[PDB]
Design a protein around this nucleic acid. Structure first.
Ligand SMILES: [Mg+2]
Ligand SMILES: [Mg+2]
Ligand SMILES: [Mg+2]
Ligand SMILES: [Mg+2]
Ligand SMILES: [Mg+2]
Ligand SMILES: [Mg+2]
Ligand SMILES: [Mg+2]
Ligand SMILES: [Mg+2]
Ligand SMILES: [Mg+2]
Lengths: 59, 52, 143, 164
RNA sequence: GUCGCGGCGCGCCGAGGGCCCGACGCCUGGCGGAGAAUCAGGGUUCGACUCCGGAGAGCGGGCCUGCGAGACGGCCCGCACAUCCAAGGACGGCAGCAGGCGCGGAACUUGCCCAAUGCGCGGCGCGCGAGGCAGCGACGGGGAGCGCGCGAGCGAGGCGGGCCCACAGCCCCCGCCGCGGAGCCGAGGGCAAGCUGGUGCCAGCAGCCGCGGUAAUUCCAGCUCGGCGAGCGUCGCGCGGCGCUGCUGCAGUUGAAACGCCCGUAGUUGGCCCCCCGCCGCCACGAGGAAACGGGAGCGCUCCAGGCAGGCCCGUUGGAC
RNA sequence: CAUCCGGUCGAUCCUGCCGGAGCGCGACGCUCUCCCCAAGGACGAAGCCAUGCAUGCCCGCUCACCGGACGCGGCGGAC
């Protein structure tokens, strides 16, 4: 019978772009969501790179 | 000398009773409304004889 | 009176009770430590052992019966006990050199019933409860 | 640690010390039939709550009338009892509380209030109707049989508008 | 010498210090407290684990950097283990999160993410196995149900749409079809609950008393019946039962128990009397000092176990004590 | 939330213990429809450890490649 919620009204679209968490923008039709990558691969890459010395941009 | 020397009738098929609160209804009616001389007991021979 | 009752006599009363509460058999058996070091189960609900001999024990004078029991050796102690399998015809399910789980009787460590000098019960053999095997809930075709 | 460790919890009922007692079994079955109770945990819950109220009343009664704590706690307890309808309005003395009994608790259950309103044929019918969500309190659907109705909501209990 | 007082260390001098108001020694399957279990009142037992404090990172020692470490996801040595070697050499420390072996009666996924609470660095941010989310999960706690009625109605479940979510579930709401399933113990007494067939002191039951040597009211089966109930039963431990450890509150002629008698130090206990001053105990009040837990005021998470919320026209809305 | 019951005798009253009846903590066993909360290798092995992850950030210093690399330096790593 009863539904309760919240709302947030912004004066400009720029303000909504700055003061706003991303996932809200993604849920709304404001921006597009790049395909997320697994943090496990990122940690593996970071460790591998830390293993190398000097110029490690190869790995 | 053989263990298990001491160790056949079939099971009689009867409708299942009403379980849950319903069981409480019939028990209430069994011994507070529905009849159960010579005082009363719970399933002595004489009472069982009449129903048979 | 017989007991000291002065306002500055707490120490004596404490000492008297400390000394005298060792005269109860139960309190001694619990708080002395000999029983724990003598109990083969070391204060455990039940133990796991290996059966090595299947034997029958006569009952006491007013009764007449031969009860079925087995000799067990506990894995974690290597000592010997006698454990009794009560349920009818359940000896045939127990085989020599089999893994068993053995628990206690109702009383803590006294003999129960007409069985002389027996204080343990068999409950599981080969991983299956004896009570379940007796009711045919499961079968021991793995052994 | 997990925040779930700080969540509290408690029991709500007590079991009798002597279970096999003929008069107790008879009385409990009688009450169960009269109010159509599911199991015997409900009676134990009622006894628990009654014991809590009685203990509070005892502790307050041991003290003097003009004790600030006595006034505060008695006022709160009486207000709660009156609002809940367990105690009659015209009683405003702590002595009357000790005479209360579980049947008074039972009479304020939802089944009872809708039965005395002629809205249901029987307690069992009331329970069946409550489960199917054909009933409402203050415009809100309540499907808990053991829900207790306050006095101010007694006239606000009706059939659900959306029910068939 | 130390940041610093100090037998903390060294030299010299003197002789002292502790003990039945229990020293010293030995033992502990000994981390402590806030607290937990039990329940008339007085108490007994426990306290690995959420907060605080301490200690350790295979055992025993040493040290650099730095405000701060005698640090171990920092270095050096000895010992016990372990690894790679193209045999000259090199290398390691899960009582961090997952996972594996052994042990045991006994204990889960080698998952996703910093969006929330915080920390580090830093201006429009990064990172964090802290922490959060999900998975297994009958430790356990709370709420509903397997029908009501002479016909209607509603569940679980499936197919779709919303809401929620870092992404997804879950709860909740909206539409079309619609799986209605109770076991575990017992029936001689304690202790609520009895009819045929077998066996024959054998087989077996039985916490205790006891049953079974031709009706077995007690074994094994069928019928029936009772208790609790999505839970029931068995084993071990603690409290209670127990006024059978007795302060409240036991007993001591004969049941278990007054030293063979006297003197006597520590210890315990000591008649009556002063009208007011000082000191000790005592009672009351107060300050000061963490919460959580417990108690408790107010608030319809649909109720409840819970949580501190919440309503519009709010004590300065509240979280008092 | 101040409770007892069965057992020594040919019968009876006592002392006195044995056993039963309740709550909680764990393990074993049978069974299990729906929702909510929720503990989880502590129990004389502080025994042994393959595999992966658990501490980074950045103001200063750019003739680096086309300013992002990298490095010096600073803070933190003693929570
Ligand atoms: Mg220790
Ligand atoms: Mg700590
Ligand atoms: Mg350390
Ligand atoms: Mg170190
Ligand atoms: Mg390590
Ligand atoms: Mg560290
Ligand atoms: Mg005595
Ligand atoms: Mg004599
Ligand atoms: Mg004597």
């Amino acid at each position: 019978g009863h539904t309760v919620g919240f709302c947030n009204a912004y004066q400009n679209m720029d303000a909504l772009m700055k003061y706003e968490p991303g996932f809200r923008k993604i849920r709304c039709g404001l921006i597009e969501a790049p395909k997320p990558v697994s943090r496990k691969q990122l940690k593996n890459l970071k460790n591998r790179r830390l293993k190398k010395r000097g110029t490690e941009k190869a790995t | 000398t053989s263990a298990g020397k001491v160790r056949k009738k079939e099971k009689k098929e009867k409708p299942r009773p009403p379980r849950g609160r319903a069981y409480k209804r019939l028990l209430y009616n069994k011994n507070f409304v529905d009849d159960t001389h010579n005082g009363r007991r719970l399933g002595p021979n004489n009472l069982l004889i009449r129903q048979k | 009176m017989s007991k000291t009752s002065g306002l500055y006599t707490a120490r004596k009363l404490r000492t008297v009770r400390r000394v005298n509460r060792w005269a109860d058999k139960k309190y001694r058996k619990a708080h002395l430590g000999t029983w724990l070091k003598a109990n083969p189960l070391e204060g455990a609900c039940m133990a796991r052992g290996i059966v090595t001999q299947k034997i029958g024990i006569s009952a006491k004078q007013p009764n007449s019966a031969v009860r079925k029991a087995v000799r067990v050796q506990l894995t974690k102690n290597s000592k010997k006990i006698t454990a009794f399998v009560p349920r009818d015809g359940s000896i045939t399910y127990i085989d020599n050199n089999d893994e068993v789980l053995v628990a206690g009787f109702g009383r803590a460590g006294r003999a129960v019933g007409d069985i002389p000098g027996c204080r343990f019960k068999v409950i599981k053999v080969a991983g299956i409860g004896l009570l379940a095997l007796f009711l045919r809930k499961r079968e021991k075709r793995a052994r | 640690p997990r925040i779930s460790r700080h969540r509290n919890s408690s029991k709500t009922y007590s079991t009798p010390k002597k279970p096999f007692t003929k008069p107790r079994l008879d009385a409990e079955l009688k009450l169960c039939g009269e109010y159509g109770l599911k199991c015997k945990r409900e009676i134990y819950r009622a006894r628990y709550m009654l014991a809590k109220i009685r203990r509070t009343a005892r502790n307050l009664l041991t003290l003097d009338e003009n004790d600030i704590k006595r006034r505060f706690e008695g006022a709160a307890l009486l207000r709660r009892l009156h609002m809940l309808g367990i105690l009659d309005e015209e009683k405003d003395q702590l002595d009357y509380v000790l005479g209360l009994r579980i049947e008074d608790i039972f009479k304020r259950r939802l089944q009872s209030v809708i039965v005395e309103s002629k809205l249901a044929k029987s307690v069992h019918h009331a329970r069946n109707m409550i489960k199917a969500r054909h009933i409402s309190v203050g415009g809100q659907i309540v499907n808990i049989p053991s829900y207790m109705v306050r006095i101010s909501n007694t006239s606000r209990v009706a059939i659900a508008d959306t029910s068939s």
